[PDB]
Amino acid sequence: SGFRKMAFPSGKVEGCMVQVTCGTTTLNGLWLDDVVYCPRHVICTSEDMLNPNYEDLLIRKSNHNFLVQAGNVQLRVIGHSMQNCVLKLKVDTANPKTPKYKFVRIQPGQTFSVLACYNGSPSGVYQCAMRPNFTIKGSFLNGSCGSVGFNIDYDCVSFCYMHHMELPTGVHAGTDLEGNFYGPFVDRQTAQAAGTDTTITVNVLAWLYAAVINGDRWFLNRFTTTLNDFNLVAMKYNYEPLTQDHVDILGPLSAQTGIAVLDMCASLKELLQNGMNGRTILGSALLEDEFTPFDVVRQCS
Amino acid sequence: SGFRKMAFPSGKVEGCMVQVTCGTTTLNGLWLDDVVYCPRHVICTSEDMLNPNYEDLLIRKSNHNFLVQAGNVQLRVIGHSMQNCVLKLKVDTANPKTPKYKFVRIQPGQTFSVLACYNGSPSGVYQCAMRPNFTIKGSFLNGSCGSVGFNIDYDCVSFCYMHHMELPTGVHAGTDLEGNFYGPFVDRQTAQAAGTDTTITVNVLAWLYAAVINGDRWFLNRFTTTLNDFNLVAMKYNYEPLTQDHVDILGPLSAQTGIAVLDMCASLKELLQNGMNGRTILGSALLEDEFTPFDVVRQCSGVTF
Ligand SMILES: O=C(C[C@@]1(C(=O)Nc2cncc3ccccc23)CCOc2ccc(Cl)cc21)N1CCCC[C@@H]1c1cn[nH]c1
Numbered sequence: 124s125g126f127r128k129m130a131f132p133s134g135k136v137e138g139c140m141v142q143v144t145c146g147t148t149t150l151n152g153l154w155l156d157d158v159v160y161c162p163r164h165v166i167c168t169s170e171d172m173l174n175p176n177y178e179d180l181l182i183r184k185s186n187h188n189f190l191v192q193a194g195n196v197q198l199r200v201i202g203h204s205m206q207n208c209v210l211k212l213k214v215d216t217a218n219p220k221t222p223k224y225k226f227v228r229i230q231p232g233q234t235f236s237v238l239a240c241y242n243g244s245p246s247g248v249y250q251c252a253m254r255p256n257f258t259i260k261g262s263f264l265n266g267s268c269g270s271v272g273f274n275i276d277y278d279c280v281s282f283c284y285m286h287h288m289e290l291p292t293g294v295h296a297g298t299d300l301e302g303n304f305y306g307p308f309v310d311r312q313t314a315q316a317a318g319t320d321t322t323i324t325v326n327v328l329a330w331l332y333a334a335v336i337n338g339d340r341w342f343l344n345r346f347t348t349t350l351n352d353f354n355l356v357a358m359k360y361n362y363e364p365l366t367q368d369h370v371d372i373l374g375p376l377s378a379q380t381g382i383a384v385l386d387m388c389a390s391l392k393e394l395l396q397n398g399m400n401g402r403t404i405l406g407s408a409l410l411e412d413e414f415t416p417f418d419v420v421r422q423c424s
Numbered sequence: 425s426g427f428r429k430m431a432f433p434s435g436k437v438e439g440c441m442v443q444v445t446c447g448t449t450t451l452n453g454l455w456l457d458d459v460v461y462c463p464r465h466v467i468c469t470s471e472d473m474l475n476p477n478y479e480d481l482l483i484r485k486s487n488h489n490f491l492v493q494a495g496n497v498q499l500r501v502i503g504h505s506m507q508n509c510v511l512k513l514k515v516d517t518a519n520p521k522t523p524k525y526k527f528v529r530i531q532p533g534q535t536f537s538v539l540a541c542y543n544g545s546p547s548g549v550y551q552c553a554m555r556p557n558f559t560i561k562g563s564f565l566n567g568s569c570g571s572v573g574f575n576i577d578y579d580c581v582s583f584c585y586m587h588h589m590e591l592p593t594g595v596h597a598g599t600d601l602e603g604n605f606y607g608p609f610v611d612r613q614t615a616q617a618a619g620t621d622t623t624i625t626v627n628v629l630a631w632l633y634a635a636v637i638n639g640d641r642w643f644l645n646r647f648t649t650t651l652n653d654f655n656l657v658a659m660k661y662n663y664e665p666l667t668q669d670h671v672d673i674l675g676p677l678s679a680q681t682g683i684a685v686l687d688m689c690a691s692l693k694e695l696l697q698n699g700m701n702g703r704t705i706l707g708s709a710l711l712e713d714e715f716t717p718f719d720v721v722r723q724c725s726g727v728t729f
Contacts, residue, residue, distance in 0.1 A: 125590075125595075127563035128550065129548035129549065130431060130550065132435075132548065133433045135435075138435065245435075251428065266726065408708075408710045
């Protein structure tokens with residue numbers, strides 16, 4: 124019993140964190156085999172940030188301009204290339220702590236753990252989701268750029284996010300490990316704003332099923348709904364449309380609890396209408412949307 | 425910007441998790457140097473959990489009854505001893521991944537990271553607090569016993585908790601690494617219930633300061649209160665008494681935000697008697713009490729490990 128927001132053990136990722144310095148800029152790098160991946164804006168100054176020509180800035184750099192530090196050991200950079208918004212620094216030593224890994228691009232609603240680092244030193248681990256507006260509600264300070272998001276499934280680390288910027292509303296934007304940004308963001312200090320955020324409906328439903336598995340049934344009702352009627356109501360609360368894929372994905376939890384997805388949708392409609400009336404669901408007074416259907420199955424039966 | 429419930433990086437602890445099997449019971453062990461620490465109830469079966477003379481049950485056991493597994497390598501047990509509710513299994517091999525560590529006993533309100541494991545395999549890390557009723561609101565399933573709680577200070581892992589059991593209300597109970605239970609709990613099959621819980625007041629105040637540092641000021645007011653008037657209010661709402669030590673501990677956050685501790689207490693007093701009025705603080709509709717004053721400083725400054 125118990126339901127917590129849980130991050131993956133960060134050990135496999137900690138052994139990959141390095142410090143990357145270029146001039147006055149110091150951020151984090153991910154050292155996998157003989158390559159260190161980091162945000163390409165490590166070559167920029169604060170003035171360059173408005174309209175940087177990264178290819179023009181990178182052509183003016185040589186290997187010895189990039190100082191890479193793995194603990195108290197400086198790594199020698201023997202090459203450099205840019206792949207989208209990520210700089211790939213070829214180093215002379217392969218990381219002996221390199222885990223089994225892969226680079227995966229996630230979709231909004233998906234969750235992952237963040238290992239927040241400063242100066243190539245991991246300082247904390249937390250769990251979060253890719254918001255439908257492609258931002259993450261992270262916890263990042265100056266120097267955290269290059270911190271990575273990941274999932275671990277049977278000894279394999281799936282790297283899905285690299286932190287690049289903080290938007291004016293306090294939310295964070297970044298890329299997959301191939302340097303492709305999530306969302307309409309650019310690595311420029313130009314006027315960028317996160318689009319209106321929405322609640323990840325499939326995740327709230329998964330979390331309501333986790334509440335039922337943990338013995339919380341107070342919010343259930345005798346009603347059902349059509350998928351269309353659910354979405355007409357959901358849209359008015361800034362909830363993401365529930366697709367037939369979401370309904371299919373919730374199938375196993377529906378079978379485990381004996382509550383049809385469209386019956387669980389009717390409970391959600393009612394919760395949106397009524398609020399919680401001073402009650403909590405899994406210790407929460409708000410509807411939690413940062414646990415996917417797969418996280419629920421993982422953590423509780 | 426951003427405020428998350430954050431755990432310490434678990435790497436130094438992951439390199440210590442082992443699987444301990446004795447008879448039908450499988451749980452987790454903490455391998456530090458040549459000793460594996462685990463709950464003493466691993467010797468327990470059907471009649472062992474009911475009327476348990478743990479020294480009498482342990483004296484029967486031979487070293488080879490305890491199967492210890494560190495990854496795909498079986499460790500040979502060369503000795504065994506009990507210290508309170510923890511079994512100490514002397515192994516032949518010293519763990520080469522043993523970090524700099526110490527065993528510390530924490531006080532209620534203090535927070536720590538828990539590396540939840542199943543079969544000596546770490547599966548998740550979460551942050552939590554020792555409740556004033558000595559329970560933890562953790563997330564554990566069968567096989568999680570022996571999972572440990574810890575803090576990191578520089579390069580030193582301070583082991584503070586070892587999971588032993590789940591109470592009927594879904595909360596968890598365990599010991600420090602010397603086998604001494606937190607709270608009035610015993611490690612056996614008996615009617616045990618967590619006492620009525622209270623809110624960790626100093627932690628809610630720290631979290632209100634973290635909200636101010638993150639630009640949330642809607643709950644602030646022009647008012648102040650005396651420590652006694654706040655404590656009369658806090659006692660009514662099942663909040664732990666705020667001591668002068670708590671007020672002193674909140675001093676740095678008070679100096680950073682310009683809000684006196686008793687000034688922030690008046691804000692908390694109003695939140696208790698009037699609620700949040702449909703508003704949230706740091707994305708929360710409830711007053712959060714699982715961030716200590718130190719956690720707030722560490723996260724709203726950027727300390728690394
Ligand atoms: O601070 C940036 C990147 C930046 C950004 O957003 N950073 C931050 C990230 N996360 C959390 C933060 C919290 C507080 C302040 C800054 C934060 C600045 C704002 O404008 C942009 C715009 C786009 C991009 Cl991709 C990046 C940034 N620096 C970049 C140029 C050199 C100095 C410097 C830096 C030094 N070490 N690492 C980076």
